């Protein structure tokens, strides 16, 4: 028997090469069945061919096989809560994928490795079925049918070694529950080893801080109950007993700071032992060392316990390193910013000695810019020597700014064509910009306001602004209530403190008016302006060109502006007419915003946001109306319309139209109006105060990925607006808008989606304290950057 020809069957990656490698014989060598055995074992070793038939036609070999490779495809059916990526982890963990193991015998292993996953999850009550759609020449689609009935259930956990304490009271801090409350009808009833470990360590910490050093754990035993429901636990422990702190015997390496080092360790006798306090104090010492700056100095305490009286003398040893490792830094995340834009804030610099406080404060001011997404950094030890350290501020930068457009329903023309745009670090520069306007068929408007916050090295903030509100009843320009105006406001901002800044500068403005409508406080102010036109028609005109001095103060001790969580910021702004100008007054305003986190989980948080404002004439004068405060608009207050709050318009019988479509217009003698026509439409006022109190709401059920990029709350908001220059002389016989007593109020929700297109919020609420006709909508939308 000598092989004359071999049919080297084997395909889809291999050829005659691998089979001939399998065979020991060429054409003209004695043939055997050791080739059969070697081929089968080698093909189970490699795992290509499920079987071999090395047969011989006389003395002519032939190879007939089946193949474990290609798995053409996979399907997953019934994987309710488990997602196919974790299934893929199980699969690659099995080394199983396309072009891999086969042999349906292995299904038990596969299902086992599936069961294992559930066996690890917390379940055991389930199974899986793999099914083969056979496909030609080797191939197979593997569909997986997941019989996932239900996981087992937590029942009751008992512990013994608890005389000083109830069990439930200490249970109360755990993730897990042997029973749900009713004031929280929802609540998990699941299992996890990790949460269990945390509860264990939590108990350990509890009995540490109540002083029990002889506390331990002996063990803990889970009930693995038939029928696949019952998980109790029984826990074995030492209660021990508390000790009492008696003394401290710290030592170590100090660099002569021993005084202040002790000043950390200053304590009262009779206070109980608590290793939490110990850890706290240790960390405080670490921080102190960071102040002078020491990278990796060692700490270690020693509780020298006296069991004769249950007390301890706490020795400590310490190992200070060295200082001024400050070689360099790095930054990562910058694809748009410029390096200087960081370093300007970095109170630390390269080539220095260290202070970690500097670095913390750098992160703080950084985030307080609110010009990024995520923040972190590492104090990367330098490998050249144990004497230098570099830093990397490997972080992320936000794409932001926003073009403004769109508004609630209204006229066919008059709900669009409105500009408004922000970059605020324009072109990745830190130059900050806001530009707006609107074209309409009854007015037009332009305004630009731009600042370089860092004209100089110091954070010198050079800001300038102009406007041209070309309002003349645009595209009519005749016999209509024109107020065309245009002016300038240009100032500076001074870094005063690490958290506090000032503002000071000037403005110079011109106004121009025509065909003014008889209204009451209008002519009040104007008779204070010393101009006494008629009170009947709208054939009237008036202009000004004035100067002013503006200024303000700002506090900001805060976390960020992306989605702030803790701290507060306030913007005070005052301004005044100057001497020599036409008009004489001041206007002063102040907007506060405070964030208080409940936990440092940074998910249940309080907001207090308010505005307080007042301005008034000088020289016994009245301010021009158009500088009045305003309110509502779902950007300061919601559940109302913008500028639709406070004292309101009041009308005379009008004696002048220069039109008559059908006299669609209100209150004229030409229409047939007398008997002074009170009205509803709003005007603004001189005095304002508003308040807002909100609970941050964690999101209902959202992916962390973008839930970190979304914010929400409920609120209760209210406020009010009024005049003092109101009277009762002829105001009588009307609703007197004098006093801050028609107080407006509502409450609702806030829904802050962060798109890449700017910040966007929809909103709902409901008015409660409504007064004389005031419009509103609860379902509202907006894009502005209000607080």
């Amino acid at each position: 028997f000598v092989v004359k020809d071999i049919h080297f069957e084997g395909l889809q990656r291999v050829a005659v090469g691998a089979a001939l490698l399998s065979m020991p014989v060429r054409t003209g060598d004695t043939v055997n069945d050791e080739d059969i055995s070697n081929t089968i074992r080698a093909l189970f070793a490699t795992g290509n061919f499920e079987d071999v038939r090395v047969l011989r036609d006389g003395d002519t070999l032939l190879v007939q096989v089946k193949e474990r490779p290609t798995i053409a495809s996979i399907t997953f059916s019934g994987n309710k809560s488990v997602k196919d990526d974790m299934l893929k982890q199980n699969l690659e963990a099995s080394g199983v994928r396309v072009g891999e193991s086969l042999d349906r015998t292995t299904i038990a292993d596969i299902e086992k490795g599936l069961e294992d996953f559930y066996y690890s999850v917390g379940k055991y009550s389930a199974s899986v079925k793999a099914v083969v759609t056979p496909l030609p020449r080797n191939r197979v689609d593997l569909k997986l049918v997941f019989q996932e009935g239900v996981s087992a259930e937590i029942q009751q956990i008992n512990i013994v070694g608890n005389h000083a304490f109830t069990t439930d009271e200490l249970i109360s801090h755990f993730q897990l529950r042997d029973e749900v409350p009713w004031w929280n009808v929802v609540g998990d009833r699941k299992y996890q080893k990790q949460k269990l470990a945390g509860d264990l360590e939590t108990l350990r910490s509890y009995y540490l801080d109540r002083g029990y050093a002889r506390f331990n754990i002996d063990s803990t035993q889970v009930s693995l109950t038939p029928d696949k429901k019952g998980i109790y636990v029984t826990v074995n422990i030492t209660e021990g007993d508390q000790y009492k702190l008696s003394g401290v015997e710290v030592s170590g390496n100090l660099a002569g700071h021993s005084a202040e080092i002790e000043q950390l360790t200053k304590i009262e006798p009779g206070e109980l032992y608590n290793g939490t306090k110990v850890t706290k104090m240790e960390d405080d010492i670490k921080k102190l060392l960071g102040r002078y700056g020491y990278a990796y100095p060692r700490v270690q305490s020693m509780p020298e316990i006296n069991d004769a009286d249950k007390t301890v003398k706490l020795r400590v040893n310490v190992d200070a390193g060295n200082r001024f490792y400050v070689r360099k830094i790095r930054f990562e995340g910058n694809d748009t910013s410029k390096d200087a834009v960081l370093r300007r804030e970095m109170r630390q610099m390269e080539g220095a000695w260290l202070g970690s406080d500097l670095v913390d404060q750098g992160k703080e001011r950084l985030n307080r810019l609110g010009f990024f997404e995520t923040v972190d950094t590492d104090t990367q030890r330098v490998p050249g020597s144990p004497d230098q350290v570099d830093v990397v501020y490997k972080v992320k930068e936000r794409n932001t700014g926003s073009f403004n457009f769109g508004i609630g329903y209204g006229t066919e023309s008059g709900v669009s064509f409105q500009a408004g745009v922000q970059q605020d670090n324009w072109l990745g520069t830190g130059y900050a910009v806001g530009i707006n306007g609107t074209k309409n068929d009854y007015q037009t408007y332009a305004e630009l306001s731009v600042t370089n916050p860092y004209f100089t090295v110091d954070g010198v903030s050079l800001g300038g602004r102009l406007f041209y509100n070309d309002f003349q009843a645009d595209d009519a320009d005749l016999s209509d209530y024109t107020n065309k105006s245009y002016g300038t406001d240009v100032t500076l901002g001074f870094p005063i403190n690490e958290y506090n800044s000032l503002r000071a500068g000037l403005g110079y403005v011109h106004n121009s008016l025509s065909n003014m409508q008889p209204q009451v406080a209008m002519w009040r102010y104007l008779y204070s302006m010393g101009e006494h036109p008629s009170t009947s028609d709208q054939d009237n005109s008036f202009k000004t060109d004035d100067f002013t001095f503006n200024y303000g103060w700002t506090y900001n001790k805060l976390d960020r502006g992306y989605f702030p969580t803790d701290g507060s910021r306030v913007n005070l702004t005052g301004k005044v007419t100057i001497p020599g100008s036409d008009n004489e007054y001041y206007k002063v305003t102040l907007d506060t915003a405070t964030y208080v986190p409940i936990d440092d989980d940074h998910k249940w948080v309080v907001l207090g946001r308010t505005r307080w404002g007042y301005g008034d004439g000088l020289g016994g004068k009245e301010m021009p109306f158009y500088e009045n405060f305003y309110a509502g608009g779902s950007s300061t207050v919601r559940g109302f319309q913008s500028n639709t709050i406070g004292p309101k318009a009041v009308y005379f019988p009008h004696q002048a139209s220069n039109y008559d479509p059908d006299y669609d217009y209100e209150c004229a003698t030409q229409d047939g109006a007398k008997d002074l026509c009170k009205s509803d439409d709003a005007v603004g006022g001189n005095a304002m105060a508003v308040a807002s109190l909100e609970f941050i709401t964690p999101t209902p059920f959202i992916s962390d990925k973008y839930a970190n990029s979304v914010r929400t709350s409920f609120f209760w908001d209210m406020g009010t607006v009024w005049d003092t220059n109101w009277d009762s002389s002829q105001y009588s016989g009307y609703p007197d808008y004098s006093d801050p007593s028609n107080i407006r109020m509502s409450a609702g929700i806030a829904l802050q989606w962060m798109s890449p297109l700017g910040p966007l919020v929809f909103s709902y609420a409901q008015p409660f304290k409504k007064y004389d006709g005031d419009k509103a909508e609860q379902f509202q939308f907006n894009i502005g950057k209000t607080w």
């Epitope: 002519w523 010393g530 006494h532 036109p533």
Partner: antibody
């Protein structure tokens, strides 16, 4: 306080410029008027000018023939009377208005009588 | 236009008695009247603003009453020096101005 300067006698149809000066008041921010009283107890408001030159009102009897102006720098009110008739002869008062309340006068001069006659 | 009706043109009364001077308005003005007193050979002076409010440094005796249809001035325990001619004035219609005829206060001896 309110000093007036004007014509004695002129012929109907001629022109005449009266001046009126304020001494102890600012003269700014004050609405100013010219009001004539004819012997015979007929009181007539003839003119009003605002603190600025934006709103000027004349009587329907007077019409544009007369011109009322003010100079804050010189604290002077200027009245030009053109197109003059015998009826125009009257006691002419330089009158002020009331700040911060409006809708009525506060100050009147002694009054300067003009008598036109051929 | 507006009619400042004032009657009687000339009045007279003794010292110590009160007087009610009627002033009637044609268009039922919503209380927008002013009272001015012109004594003989003197510049006219302000008596009442707002149609009921007395001017600074003036005795309380003078009072303003009535509505747009009709107003009245009350002087209580009038003294010898108050003899003057008193007029009404409306400011409700600003463009034009109508005065009263002047009420001439005499005394009774």
């Amino acid at each position: 306080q309110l000093v007036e300067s004007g014509g004695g006698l002129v012929q109907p149809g001629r022109s005449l410029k009266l001046s009126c000066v304020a001494s102890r008041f600012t003269f700014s921010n004050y609405g100013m008027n010219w009001i004539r009283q004819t012997p015979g107890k007929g009181l007539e408001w003839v003119a009003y000018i605002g603190s600025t030159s934006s709103h000027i009102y004349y009587a329907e009897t007077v019409k544009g023939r007369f011109t009322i102006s003010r100079d804050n720098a010189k604290n002077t009110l200027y009245l030009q009377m053109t197109g003059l008739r015998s009826e125009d002869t009257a006691l002419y008062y330089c009158v002020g208005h009331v700040r911060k309340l409006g809708a009525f006068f506060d100050y009147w001069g002694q009054g300067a009588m003009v008598t036109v006659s051929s | 236009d507006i009619q400042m009706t004032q009657s009687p043109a000339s009045l007279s009364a003794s010292l110590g008695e009160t007087v009610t001077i009627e002033c009637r308005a044609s268009e039922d003005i919503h209380s927008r009247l002013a009272w001015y007193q012109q004594k003989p050979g003197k510049s006219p002076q302000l008596l009442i603003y707002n149609a009921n409010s007395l001017h600074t440094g003036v005795p309380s005796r003078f009072s303003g009453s009535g509505s747009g249809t009709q107003f009245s001035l009350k002087i209580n325990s009038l003294q010898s020096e108050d003899v003057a001619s008193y007029f009404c004035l409306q400011y409700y219609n600003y463009p034009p101005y109508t005065f009263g005829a002047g009420a001439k206060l005499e005394l009774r001896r």
